[PDB]
Design an enzyme around this catalytic site. Structure first.
Site, short mmCIF file in Angstrom:
data_model
loop_
_atom_site.label_atom_id
_atom_site.label_comp_id
_atom_site.label_asym_id
_atom_site.label_seq_id
_atom_site.Cartn_x
_atom_site.Cartn_y
_atom_site.Cartn_z
N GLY B 159 0.79 -1.22 0.00
CA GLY B 159 0.00 0.00 0.00
C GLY B 159 0.83 1.28 0.00
O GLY B 159 0.35 2.33 -0.44
N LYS B 211 3.12 3.34 6.88
CA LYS B 211 2.11 3.58 7.91
C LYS B 211 2.65 3.29 9.31
O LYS B 211 2.57 4.13 10.21
CB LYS B 211 0.86 2.74 7.62
CG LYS B 211 -0.35 3.10 8.47
CD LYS B 211 -1.58 2.30 8.06
CE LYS B 211 -2.75 2.59 9.00
NZ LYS B 211 -4.00 1.96 8.49
N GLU B 217 11.00 -4.64 4.88
CA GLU B 217 11.57 -4.26 3.58
C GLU B 217 11.83 -2.77 3.53
O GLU B 217 12.91 -2.34 3.12
CB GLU B 217 10.64 -4.67 2.43
CG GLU B 217 10.45 -6.18 2.32
CD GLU B 217 9.17 -6.68 2.96
OE1 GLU B 217 8.58 -7.63 2.41
OE2 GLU B 217 8.77 -6.15 4.02
N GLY B 272 -3.72 0.89 3.91
CA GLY B 272 -2.56 1.03 3.04
C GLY B 272 -2.95 1.00 1.57
O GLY B 272 -2.55 1.87 0.78
N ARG B 273 -3.74 0.00 1.19
CA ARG B 273 -4.19 -0.15 -0.20
C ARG B 273 -5.26 0.87 -0.61
O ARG B 273 -5.78 0.82 -1.73
CB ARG B 273 -4.66 -1.58 -0.47
CG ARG B 273 -5.84 -2.02 0.39
CD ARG B 273 -6.20 -3.48 0.25
NE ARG B 273 -7.14 -3.92 1.28
CZ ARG B 273 -6.79 -4.29 2.51
NH1 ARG B 273 -5.51 -4.27 2.89
NH2 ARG B 273 -7.72 -4.66 3.38
N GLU B 358 -6.41 -8.25 -1.78
CA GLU B 358 -6.08 -8.07 -0.37
C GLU B 358 -7.29 -7.67 0.46
O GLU B 358 -7.37 -7.98 1.65
CB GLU B 358 -4.95 -7.07 -0.18
CG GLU B 358 -4.25 -7.26 1.16
CD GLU B 358 -3.40 -6.09 1.55
OE1 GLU B 358 -3.20 -5.18 0.73
OE2 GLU B 358 -2.94 -6.08 2.71
N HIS B 389 -2.03 -10.42 -28.12
CA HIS B 389 -0.93 -11.22 -28.64
C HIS B 389 -0.24 -12.02 -27.55
O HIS B 389 0.82 -12.61 -27.78
CB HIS B 389 0.12 -10.32 -29.31
CG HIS B 389 -0.45 -9.39 -30.32
ND1 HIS B 389 -0.29 -9.57 -31.68
CD2 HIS B 389 -1.19 -8.26 -30.19
CE1 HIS B 389 -0.90 -8.60 -32.33
NE2 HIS B 389 -1.46 -7.79 -31.45
N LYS B 519 4.32 -10.67 7.77
CA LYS B 519 5.28 -9.82 8.47
C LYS B 519 5.82 -10.42 9.77
O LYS B 519 6.68 -9.82 10.43
CB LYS B 519 4.64 -8.45 8.74
CG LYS B 519 4.08 -7.78 7.49
CD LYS B 519 3.43 -6.45 7.80
CE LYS B 519 4.04 -5.35 6.94
NZ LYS B 519 3.23 -4.10 6.87
O1 LIG Z 1 -2.78 -1.82 3.53
C1 LIG Z 1 -2.35 -2.79 2.96
O2 LIG Z 1 -2.73 -3.01 1.73
C2 LIG Z 1 -1.43 -3.74 3.69
O3 LIG Z 1 -1.53 -3.43 5.08
C3 LIG Z 1 0.03 -3.73 3.17
O4 LIG Z 1 0.11 -3.81 1.74
C4 LIG Z 1 0.86 -2.54 3.66
O5 LIG Z 1 0.53 -1.41 2.88
C5 LIG Z 1 2.36 -2.84 3.53
O6 LIG Z 1 2.69 -3.93 4.36
C6 LIG Z 1 3.23 -1.66 3.96
O7 LIG Z 1 2.94 -1.36 5.32
P1 LIG Z 1 3.51 0.00 5.94
O8 LIG Z 1 2.89 1.22 5.15
O9 LIG Z 1 3.07 0.00 7.46
O10 LIG Z 1 5.08 0.02 5.80
O1 LIG Z 2 3.56 -16.85 -31.54
C1 LIG Z 2 2.79 -16.13 -30.95
O2 LIG Z 2 2.94 -15.98 -29.64
C2 LIG Z 2 1.66 -15.43 -31.66
O3 LIG Z 2 1.64 -15.86 -33.02
C3 LIG Z 2 1.76 -13.89 -31.56
O4 LIG Z 2 2.00 -13.46 -30.22
C4 LIG Z 2 2.80 -13.25 -32.47
O5 LIG Z 2 4.10 -13.53 -31.98
C5 LIG Z 2 2.63 -11.73 -32.57
O6 LIG Z 2 1.38 -11.37 -33.14
C6 LIG Z 2 3.74 -11.13 -33.43
O7 LIG Z 2 3.64 -11.68 -34.75
P1 LIG Z 2 4.74 -11.29 -35.85
O8 LIG Z 2 6.17 -11.74 -35.32
O9 LIG Z 2 4.38 -12.02 -37.21
O10 LIG Z 2 4.73 -9.73 -36.08
#
Ligand SMILES: O=C(O)[C@H](O)[C@@H](O)[C@H](O)[C@H](O)COP(=O)(O)O
Ligand SMILES: O=C(O)[C@H](O)[C@@H](O)[C@H](O)[C@H](O)COP(=O)(O)O
Lengths: 557, 557
Positions: B159, B211, B217, B272-273, B358, B389, B519
């Site tokens: 978040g 928060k 992290e 957070g979200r 979430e 594609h 966590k």
């Molecule tokens: O609200 C949320 O969606 C969750 O609680 C979580 O995704 C949170 O945002 C992160 O863990 C960061 O937390 P802090 O902002 O406390 O560092």
């Molecule tokens: O193989 C694949 O995954 C599909 O056929 C397609 O995703 C293709 O790669 C694109 O449409 C690009 O096509 P071209 O390389 O002929 O431009």
């Protein structure tokens, strides 16, 4: 009915699941058998790092794995594999060979299509790629004003975009001495516009990546790039210095106006979503050097050989495939999550979202009969640890069963603070699958609530919210380091997983007829958008949306 | 059982689905009734652009919609909404208000928590943000060597990361004259390391977004950034010119060593979200300007007022929520795809993957009952046209039913080539939902193959593969232009959809005990990674994976 559901080994498996799957609990499986990790994992030594495929945290017993292997055998997996490798035209709807394995065939053992060895031409194009990489990387290849190239821009979509993008992202640490690489793919003019804004026509080289060389998004983007270029260069002959093509269509490459010597060829038996190993990987080779590109091919070749030579019961892509069959066709799980604990791998899930879903999102079998069972899953994911804060809530405490592959390198490319960050990253990687398996018991959560000073009333209310049922199965895929070689092996491993599942479902993993309808209908709508006149040729929704577009496109905000 | 399944209006809906849903055929619904678009769409005029929510390509009739609205009323959606907006503590597991709506309450009508209006403090922080933005963006704010700031780096996760990231990506054209913005989130050392490699300590401003200000992290990344900074500055007082905090935890902010006047406060009732609207949005406001941030807030406020005042039958977030319930609880669809035909919106699907999953990836109800029905879906997607594609093969011709929301602005930020790119983009947007709806009958494909010149044999072999069963339902959400205001309205619309679904399932959309569990998990494994000793304390998989890490971490590649 279809081949899979008429198969007696499948019928046995399904009946076993019905009678017994409720008896499968991960916690108990490990408690009952201290050799479980040993018996349900593969430690692969590639001579260039190890890949540990740990599938022990799955809802399977020895008996289940035996039944799954027997089903792979009785669905013809071994014979089908050999047919792919030998150049048989296993892409039956298009009548093509399927030979991405030839692109990385480092042994150079002959692989024939229509009686002719494909390896000379594979190697000729690789040699061309190598020479071009030397010219560009050394600075010897000059732009129209005589300056060295600093920026390479791949223009392509789907198969001609995601592979080179994902791989250059994953192998970024290997790009010293290489030009910057940019990927333009969307027709949305934002994509090329914001790319070109940060570039000089004097020092930018465009790579037009297209098998057909007719894809509308790619050709339009290419023509836009050329117009931008010629605005500065004011000399049509300068185009040969700044535009190259990766294609199978010599004629359309010429019509666009690219030098014939500037064309890096591939072949119809290279599927787009299996093409990064071919000429399509030119942007990879330019960015990280041809030596590293060869290492990438060699890693794939190692995995190809593993897939070809190994008995099914200890064959990595086969086992991953079989676990998927178990979750898809027996448990009915719609999705498969790919969760790399690696920022460089941030486009890996998106790559296999194409590789898997475009291959196995099918419903017609080899006989022409409609499937009466599930095929390919919806593939999705984001790197760890971020997911832990974002959608792992649902994985832990939602109402869906979601098989997850957790992936990580043992060694980081950036061992900052004496490895502190990577220690934490590894700890999370390990703890998450452990928690997904174990959950948290009422007795465990209760004591925690008591220690937090919760009132008897508050504890009672909170308890069920703090309990986790666990029993959520995962694969852990751990590898020494994410080198070009190891990355190549990992991609090839999933390619062969997808192949095995396709064979078992009796579908064609290698065509993509499902893109056709959208293309046809778009060609019809395109000219209708021009001008003020009402469009009435479609259903009321399509007409209504077009009316809204025409009404709203001149409004000033 | 649970509130939803015990509800008689739900059982009526489900029974109707069992008896009647197989008879719903989109092609035929549109043919039978020329008014279908008119009766199943909302054209919202915000006075700053229109948002057309076209839900006509859904597997619904008037009767289905009537039953869904009645169910929403039966589940007490309106009362629950009012309770959220009034500051009632509807986050019942954490005993908190849920007041992201207060953050953007442009009217300044008092919203009370514990008898106290929250608006003065909301506005005080907004005023502080505005002042700070002016100082930094003008060049007035100088770094430790006396230079203007050129780069801002948000450090945060979940978040505290994805909102600011998605929005600065979506609003990139509005960032001229703003500092470059970077987002660091993963503990993976690659993330901070590659970011810092591109920066000077003299001209970089770090924004520690958290928060709690305890998330592993974020605090680790922040400490790494500070060490890097201090290695250059060699002066603790210089930190005040280069580090600000967005948090609720004054004590921990002080502990880390940040100036109290460098702290931008928010409150426990900001999830957070749901936090980009608060101080967490500082990186948005710095990048695009405070005026544009205010427009973003205003757009959300418009949609809040729409949600609050509109009858359920014409209420956009309610209708989207109800269509979801239909597909989740009656059809059993595991997933919901978000497909924006906009490159700037490339992180929109990822944002709501968090916001939705979430919030609603839950299994305990308000009554303490375990749900005996599905809750939140797996949310996923990539921008069009690329998805066409990548994975649309499976959407068109796989074995999964996948509700998709297609989104697009009528007006592009980059009308290059006289609008050619956007014309093609729009054509695809329209064609794809038309194709998903209509499909292609065997007889239609037969005629196409006949006309193409296929022999009776080749035709018969190819035919089934060319058939599109169609009947695949979509929403089309089209808006005048993706401005800050319109983006704000769109985000708020989905926030409220998520809210409505949560109320109907009787779950808490606003806690995250699975994320709280997370966590708490890695701390036990961390010390076990130190040293060469074998770990035997866990299940054999965790043990085996740790052994592999220890074996492989010193290997030279
Ligand atoms: O609200 C949320 O969606 C969750 O609680 C979580 O995704 C949170 O945002 C992160 O863990 C960061 O937390 P802090 O902002 O406390 O560092
Ligand atoms: O193989 C694949 O995954 C599909 O056929 C397609 O995703 C293709 O790669 C694109 O449409 C690009 O096509 P071209 O390389 O002929 O431009």
């Amino acid at each position: 009915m279809a081949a899979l559901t008429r198969n007696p080994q499948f019928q046995k498996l399904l009946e076993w699941h019905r009678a017994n799957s409720a008896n499968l609990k991960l916690r108990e499986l490990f408690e009952a058998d201290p050799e479980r990790f040993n018996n349900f994992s593969l430690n692969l030594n590639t001579n260039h790092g190890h890949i540990l495929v740990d599938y022990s945290k799955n809802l399977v017993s020895k008996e289940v794995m035996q039944m799954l292997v027997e089903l792979a055998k009785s669905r013809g997996v071994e014979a089908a594999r050999d047919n792919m490798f030998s150049g048989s035209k296993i892409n039956y709807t298009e009548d093509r060979a399927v030979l991405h394995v030839a692109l990385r065939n480092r042994s150079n053992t002959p692989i024939k299509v229509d009686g002719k060895d494909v390896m000379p031409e594979v190697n000729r194009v690789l040699d061309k790629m190598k020479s071009f990489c030397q010219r560009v990387r050394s600075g010897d290849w000059k732009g129209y004003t005589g300056k060295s190239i600093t920026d390479i821009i791949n223009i392509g979509i789907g198969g001609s975009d995601l592979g080179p993008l994902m791989v250059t992202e994953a192998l970024k640490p290997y790009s010293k001495g290489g030009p910057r690489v940019w990927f333009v793919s969307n027709i949305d003019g934002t994509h090329i516009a914001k790319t070109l804004a940060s570039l000089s026509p004097e020092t930018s080289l465009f790579i037009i990546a297209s098998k057909t060389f007719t894809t509308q998004e790619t050709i339009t983007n290419a023509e836009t790039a050329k117009e931008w270029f010629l605005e500065a260069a004011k000399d049509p002959s300068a185009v040969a210095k700044h535009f190259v093509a990766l294609s199978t269509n010599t004629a359309k490459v010429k019509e666009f106006g690219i030098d014939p010597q500037n064309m890096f060829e591939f072949w119809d038996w290279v599927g787009g979503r299996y093409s990064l190993w071919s000429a399509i990987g030119l942007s990879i080779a330019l960015h990280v050097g041809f030596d590293h590109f060869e290492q990438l091919l060699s890693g794939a070749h190692w995995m190809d050989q593993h897939f070809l030579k190994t008995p099914l019961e200890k064959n990595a892509p086969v086992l991953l495939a079989l676990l998927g069959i178990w979750y898809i066709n027996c448990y009915g799980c719609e999705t498969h999550a790919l969760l790399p604990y690696d920022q460089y791998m941030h486009r890996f899930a998106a790559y296999f979202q194409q590789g898997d879903m475009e291959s196995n999102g099918k419903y017609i079998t080899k006989s022409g009969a409609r499937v009466d069972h599930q095929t390919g899953p919806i593939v999705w994911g984001e790197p760890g640890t971020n997911g832990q804060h974002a959608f792992y809530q649902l994985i832990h405490q939602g109402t869906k069963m979601i098989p997850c592959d957790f992936l990580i390198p043992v060694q980081t490319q950036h061992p900052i603070r004496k490895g502190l960050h990577h220690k934490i990253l590894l700890a999370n990687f390990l703890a998450q699958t452990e928690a997904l398996m174990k959950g948290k018991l009422p007795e465990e959560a209760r004591k925690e609530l008591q220690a937090a000073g919760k009132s008897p009333e508050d504890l009672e209310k909170l308890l069920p919210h703090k309990v986790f049922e666990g029993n959520r199965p995962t694969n852990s895929i751990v590898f020494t380091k994410l080198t070009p070689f190891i990355l190549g092996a990992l991609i090839a491993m999933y390619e062969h997983k997808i192949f095995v599942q396709g064979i078992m479902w009796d579908i064609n993993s290698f065509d993509q007829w499902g893109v056709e309808l959208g293309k046809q209908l778009a060609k019809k709508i395109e000219p209708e958008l021009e001008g003020s006149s009402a469009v009435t040729s479609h259903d009321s929704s399509t007409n209504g949306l077009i009316s809204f577009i025409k009404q709203q496109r001149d409004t000033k905000l």
